[PDB]
Paper text:
Usage of native protein would limit us to analysis of substrate binding using substrate analogs which could not by hydrolyzed by the enzyme, such as isopropyl β-d-1-thiogalactopyranoside (IPTG), or less preferable substrates such as ortho-nitrophenyl-β-galactoside (ONPG). Determined crystal structures of ArthβDG complexes with specific ligands may be divided into three groups: complexes with substrates and their analogues (early complexes) ArthβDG_E441Q/LACs, ArthβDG/IPTG; the second group are intermediates complexes ArthβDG_E441Q/LACd ArthβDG/ONPG; and the third one is the complex with product ArthβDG/GAL. The early complexes with substrate show LAC and IPTG binding in shallow mode, intermediate complexes depicts deep binding of substrate that directly precedes formation of galactosyl-enzyme covalent bond, and the product complex allows description of the product release process. At the early stage of the reaction, the substrate is bound in the shallow binding site where the galactosyl group is stabilized by a number of H-bonds between its hydroxyl groups and residues N110, E441, E517, M481, H520, and H368 via water molecules and by an interaction with a sodium ion.
ArthβDG is a five-domain protein of molecular weight 110 kDa. Regardless of low sequence identity, this monomer’s architecture is strikingly similar to KlyvβDG and EcolβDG, which enabled determination of catalytic residues E441 and E517. Cold-adapted ArthβDG possesses a functional dimer (not typical for the GH2 family).
Numbering used by the authors:
A (entry chain A), B (entry chain A): 22 to 1010
Amino acid sequence: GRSLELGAADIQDLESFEAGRGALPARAYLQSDAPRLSLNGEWQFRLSPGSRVAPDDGWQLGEALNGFESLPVPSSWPMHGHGAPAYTNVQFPFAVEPPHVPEANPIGDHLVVFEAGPEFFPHALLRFDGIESAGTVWLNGVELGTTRGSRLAHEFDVSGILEQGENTLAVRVAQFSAASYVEDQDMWWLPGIFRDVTLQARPAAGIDDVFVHAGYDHITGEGILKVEASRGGQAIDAVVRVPELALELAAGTEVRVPAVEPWSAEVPKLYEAAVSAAGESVALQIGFRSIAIEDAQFKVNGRRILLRGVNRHEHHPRLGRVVPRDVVEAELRLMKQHNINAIRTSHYPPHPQFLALADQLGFYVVLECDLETHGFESAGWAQNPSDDPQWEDALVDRMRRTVERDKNHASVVMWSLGNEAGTGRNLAAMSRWTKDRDPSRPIHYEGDWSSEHVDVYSRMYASQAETALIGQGIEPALNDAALDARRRAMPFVLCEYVHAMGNGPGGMSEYQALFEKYPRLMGGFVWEWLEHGITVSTADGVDHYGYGGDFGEEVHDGNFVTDGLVDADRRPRPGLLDFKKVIEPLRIDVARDWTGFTLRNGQDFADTSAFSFRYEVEADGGALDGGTVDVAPVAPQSETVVELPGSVAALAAGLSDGRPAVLTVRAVLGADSAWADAGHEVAWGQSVREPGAPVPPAPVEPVQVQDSELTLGPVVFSRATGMPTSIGGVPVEKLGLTLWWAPTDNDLGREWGGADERPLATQWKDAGLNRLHTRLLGISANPGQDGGETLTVRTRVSAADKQYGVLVDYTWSTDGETVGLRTQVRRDGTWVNRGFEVEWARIGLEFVLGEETELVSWFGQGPHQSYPDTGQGARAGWFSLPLAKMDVEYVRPQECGARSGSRSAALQLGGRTLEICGDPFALTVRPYSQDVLDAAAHRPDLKADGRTYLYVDHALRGVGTAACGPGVLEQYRLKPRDADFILTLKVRS
Amino acid sequence: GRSLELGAADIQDLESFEAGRGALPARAYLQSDAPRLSLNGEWQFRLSPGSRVAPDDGWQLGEALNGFESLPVPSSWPMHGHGAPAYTNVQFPFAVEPPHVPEANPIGDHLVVFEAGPEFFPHALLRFDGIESAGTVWLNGVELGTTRGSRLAHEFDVSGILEQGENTLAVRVAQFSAASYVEDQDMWWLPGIFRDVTLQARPAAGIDDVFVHAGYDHITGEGILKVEASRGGQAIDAVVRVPELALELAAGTEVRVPAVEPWSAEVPKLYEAAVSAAGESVALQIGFRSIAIEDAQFKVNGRRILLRGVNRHEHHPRLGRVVPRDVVEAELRLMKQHNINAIRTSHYPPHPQFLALADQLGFYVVLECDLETHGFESAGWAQNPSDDPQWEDALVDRMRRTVERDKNHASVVMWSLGNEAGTGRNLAAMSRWTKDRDPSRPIHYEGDWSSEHVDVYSRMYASQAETALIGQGIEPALNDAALDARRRAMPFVLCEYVHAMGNGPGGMSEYQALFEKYPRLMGGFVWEWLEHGITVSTADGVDHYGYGGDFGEEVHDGNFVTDGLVDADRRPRPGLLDFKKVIEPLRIDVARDWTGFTLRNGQDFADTSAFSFRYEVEADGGALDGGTVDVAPVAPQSETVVELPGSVAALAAGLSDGRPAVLTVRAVLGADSAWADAGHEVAWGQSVREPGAPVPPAPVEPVQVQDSELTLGPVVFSRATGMPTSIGGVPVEKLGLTLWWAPTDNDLGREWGGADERPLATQWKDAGLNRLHTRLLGISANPGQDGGETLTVRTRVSAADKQYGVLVDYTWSTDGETVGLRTQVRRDGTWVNRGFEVEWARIGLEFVLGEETELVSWFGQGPHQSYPDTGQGARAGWFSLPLAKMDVEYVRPQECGARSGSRSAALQLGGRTLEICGDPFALTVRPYSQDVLDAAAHRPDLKADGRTYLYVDHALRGVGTAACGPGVLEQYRLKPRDADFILTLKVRS
Ligand SMILES: CC(C)S[C@@H]1O[C@H](CO)[C@H](O)[C@H](O)[C@H]1O
Ligand SMILES: CC(C)S[C@@H]1O[C@H](CO)[C@H](O)[C@H](O)[C@H]1O
Ligand SMILES: CC(C)S[C@@H]1O[C@H](CO)[C@H](O)[C@H](O)[C@H]1O
Ligand SMILES: CC(C)S[C@@H]1O[C@H](CO)[C@H](O)[C@H](O)[C@H]1O
Ligand code: NA
Ligand code: NA
Ligand code: NA
Ligand code: NA
Ligand code: NA
Ligand code: NA
Ligand code: NA
Ligand code: NA
């Protein structure tokens, strides 16, 4: 019975249910005057493909390193050519049999040589702030211990092992371990030592841990301060000095500061402080805030707050989980610049440096533990680590390290147990551990809807309808009356909503109106802040983002990792510009007569004093009037009516009919803040004098008949097809009805509920909307006016194998300068296919012009795209962009770039300019066809063909959020219908 | 109100509901002594893309031909580079709005100049035997008329238009017309003048039409003869001479021939005859047969017959609908050579020349009218031409021309109204017209299950179960008692069954047993005889077949056109070799003791006198005994027991135990027939003395342990994986469990019935069966025998994200020469995924050898492939083939080539030979992996990689016919289970 398998001991440790061994007690991450040496830099790295063939050849000693090579540390090592990134959403990339690991399991051996001066003696520790997923640590050949909890910190005492002068630190990192079963976040699998490695001296009579407690009495204005300090687990004597408040006190004792300025996301007041013992001093930033739940409302400092949140992953398109500090600071400023006031650290603690930046810049943080067992759901949660008693110690350790590290930061207003981990005994243990350790912060966890072990009711992607019922407290009761009573007394948060994947998210405004109406609604956190795109260079040297499957994954989830409000390089998607407007903290309703505007202060604490209120009147020629208006400060949750200067109203009263003019009132920062320069726009409102309807040209030019062509003023028609073949010299290669668009990511998600759950994209393909064909029925010229005639072209549009159709009639007219086009659309037969109604993407026309377009200008909404349930950030005005800037650089190309609400448009096709006017239409211009757009999986797949594809839509459907959560709301769907609409066209040179 | 559209008159004719105009009355195709001149050859051809731009430039006159070019006539013109073939199954390739045609509609102008001598004067006609789909005919500028009914003949009188000497014939052919709506057969859309164009003189006092009536009185042996002859529609005087029967009689009168030899498919007796008037004589072949329906049985000449049928389309891989006569004769001989006795002309009349060949070679023909409106089904049959009164005249014309052309041929035993045309008034009119015109043949039509207007109950792809209930007369009743009484008194035919697409068809034997058991079952016609592959040459110059979508179709149905028993070049698929055995007309059951065989004559008319009965005993060394045995003729439907020579039994009694020997009794043709040479095999039976079970080698060699390898006799194992890395010097690159195979066409069809209707291929992908992974659990060496040891390798196989698995244990043993491998498979967890049980394709092993294989030999079933529900044609014996001949050249590559029931196998890998033995296993060898097989859409996509992929299966599931009709029958499914099996391996040089 001889056992002959290799590497059984390494594998048995990888399969362990326990937390890491050998590490010091979890504590706060603290800024200390103690000596420190960062071991970051260039290490040596050897990759082996599994435990059984990973060499046990004394490499830890740093001598005779066969097969090592330079690798930066911190790193996610697939980002540097060792293996590849792999992306899964829910599915595990290995067989599900906890706690066992697959045979293919990348093992990365890391090694670094450093110098330890006398200041690291006699006592020092090594601190690892994150290793994915299983680390074993040797120092000078001696085993220190192991790490479990990939985004949690570990510290190992090196006293009596660290030698003066030169030392050799060695770390073996296994990508997969039993811990992988509890780290199934929807993101790239990325092994490595991806956070700081640090040597820290531990002088005697020092401070190991500190627990700040800084409450605020909103009735008295008092701060309630107690700073606890400990060493070796024991409360020690230390002095706490807070200069700004005239405070010297002893650690351990609670005092009442007579008057403090409270901390909030709006006003992040931070008092500098220091706690010190004989051998060590620790610098703190203290924010006085108290969190309370009463009347089913989540309150900070005595006021219900509104969360304007995003879910923040840590991703970098070239460095993986390594986010450089400048990228962190820049992205939180970007968040502030878009009215965001809350962050959820989905779904693991962030880099320890993040916390101070959130304290300073001002965000309400939901700090989330590193726990997700989502992959067990598909088996009915069988073997779920969250309910398996053998994982209890591991999971409690995760919560402990999570809480201890960040417990001092005012910005953390909730602890979260994890994400989509099911329900189970171990989550209850983590809750009980947290409530006892830190009763000052409510506990969040969406995964158990009964809310038995949490303090707030949390859901993800609940529909607008259900959110409205919850806001009113009338959602259906829980079976357990006692649990139901508790949950009904909780405030409600959407930890994830308006999935921001691709074109979208639609429906954001309907959520926001409910957040404002019902105090029990705490708000929501958009899923998610960034796309996880990974930069890839094609053979030519062209950059684009790759996603799941682009890196050879056997199982993957494609572009579901690119679902953000900004791309991986933090460039805004249109959804972010819309989101900023949706969550703007002030509401400005400009009066129709331009005499004033209503101003509501939607903030919770600040008044309007930080803002300058600016107005401008813009017409076709440019700005006609503008200035600033003084507003006596408006209190939070109050409103007033601000008179505008009489010149504005007078200008409006004197406008001729049909002359367009736009009045915009903007609230901008009066002075530089920590997160934007003075004049930065925070909120806005407008009132528009719309251009009158266009006048059809007089039908005075007649139809000139030839053998194979017909001419009506500037329009040449092919007599065979009845379609225009050129307009004013601009060649027209095709004109026809459109009812379809290249499916968005939302259109590829399943239409849940009811008997038909085919995605909308599939419903459309089945129906043939992408392959319409047109039969000509007749061409008549008819008596117009004083010798002129109109031309009517009758057609029927359908698709192969379908009996349903639309009759489309084009009536053309011209006076020689303007072309008038009336289009009439009539349903023919019932638009049902495979048993279910067909819905349309649009009702419009596609002009394929035989010239390229360089510039597109329009009067309408802009500058960015807008669909019926989006475009809140698009304002009324005059806009002009080069063609390439009309498009949107989504990683998977899809329908985008329509400008809804357009009244006029001008395309510069070289020397000539094509001017389109008419009743409100949506405008899109591209250098490639819808089939080239739909076929493209990445942006280099789009190819220009030298034509101009011009879309003029009389109707559009919304974009919704069906990739995850609600589809298009009822009022934005587009069922087949009859339609009619007028355009004017004119070509200029 | 001026109308300006182009080509409205051409289009209005294309949209016409009427049959062609201007043609002479439909008549029989008759062999006449009248002068004839075939206008086949090289014509001139111009293609325009639609009616509106097709030139009206006097081209019919043959002068100034701008844009014409040589094109053979007959032709399907896409086959010669003008446009492309397009394939749809059910869906129309144009919008469904009868009778309107699409704007893109290929218009082919045809022109030929010919010479008409004095023998074509004063009277001649032009005959067109098929134009797809709308022809307009001019002769010397004068319009003759138009053609509707693409596979029906038209004749135009050219008296006074044909000029002596030189004439110019011009034909405009439109691909699409209103007729397209009633010609929706599942096949290539192929416009052209695809059948003969002929000039025929019509001398005075001639014969226009002839209607032969040749009945058989099976009680008296009398023939019942009446030959009708007409001219200009009127019964004329003509003399009928049948030399062989001593007959001279007048046309028009019925006589009783005292004794005739009756015609049947088994014995196609044809009497030569001639009917003549003053100016013309017509040669006929007369077969005396009477068709009757009684006692719910379809009888010919007094006996119920059994139809052994195929559905025959007309297709040629380079000429489209043009089938050269030599290909026709060769393919019907091939049919006879495979025991086929019946043909259904799916779904249109064949070339007129086909009928005489079926009379002569001997087939029961279902002659089917050119009518199919299948594309209307998806709209609930709305606007179905079969029930639209405006199509009545068109549809009756189709039936009339169909019946008139072929009414004289004994082989036509049923008229068919068409195929999948729904139900409607117009089908009733076609039935009433046929029953009145020709009461001597029953009417067939599957589309109306109530059978109101037919004489036989026909169905397609009814399950074995339902066929069994119908055979017993206990199928559920129709709602109308009167209609139910009629249908229950009808015999039952499967006009289509055992869909022969790709690997398959399975389940054929279960149908055949029912056809034999129940007299009401008439038999069935396999769908279908040939694949419609179109030869295509890749850039390299490599040939393969293309199918739907390979020719740029916008809508298509892929490889559903390659669903035949033979490929387009008439090379048999394995399904044909199986089918021939299934329908063999004699049953030979060889006795277990080898003393004799039971012989049942399954024919309906012939005895066994045409057959020589041959026996042979084959052993490992070759033939041991053989000869012929005399059998007193057995009557139809009788049986006897034929003694074999005592030497055979004695040989069997003297065989040592475990020595394999096979006794085969064959019925071969004693003498050359019209369709095969003497000795051609018609039926066979076998009795097998199976080799005893293999003896595991003695476990006397021990396990030699090294650092990274283990050696057990000739086997080297990698110590890391526990898997063999070489066996006797043959490198082993991988060994593991298989549970999956590259989906067949059947596995891609939906599993109808129940809550899960995902295709089996999809069920497997969802379950991860194609991406199994293996974790190593342990490697133990254990005490064997006299110093030797066995090696056990314990593994678990699963897939990423799945909790279910199988434990697989390999126990190896060797005495130095033979390697013994015991494999044990144990289910771990419930194999359920997405709510439904997972089923396996197989339980086996995959050896990936690092050398190429040149030759594969085995003892088992062969020579061709066999799966649990197929392989009837594979007999027991010893077989040996070069590797490339183990594969099957299906147009879409898919699982094929397994040899089930194997007892031993030998692979020649260069110099060395790998010998596998064990209990019954299935054997497959390929030069490429299953993923290369599954990914390949065409055969050039398969790529060899220099390895050998060896599959040894302990269990396989059946292949069924789920691409159309029943899936795998219950007894051949493969639910997960525990299994264990032993192999021996041995390498030789
Ligand atoms: C073929 C181009 C005109 S498509 C063009 O490519 C660019 C990348 O260079 C951007 O991705 C644009 O969004 C895209 O429109
Ligand atoms: C199968 C999905 C509905 S689960 C859904 O996937 C999303 C993908 O972005 C998010 O990650 C959500 O957290 C998750 O609930
Ligand atoms: C890459 C080859 C070994 S696959 C090989 O190709 C042949 C065509 O040349 C045949 O189609 C065989 O069936 C196929 O196995
Ligand atoms: C949708 C199918 C089940 S219809 C099915 O298609 C087959 C394809 O070979 C055959 O042509 C049959 O005639 C037809 O009934
Ligand atoms: Na949502
Ligand atoms: Na995602
Ligand atoms: Na589009
Ligand atoms: Na655009
Ligand atoms: Na069948
Ligand atoms: Na088919
Ligand atoms: Na296969
Ligand atoms: Na094979």
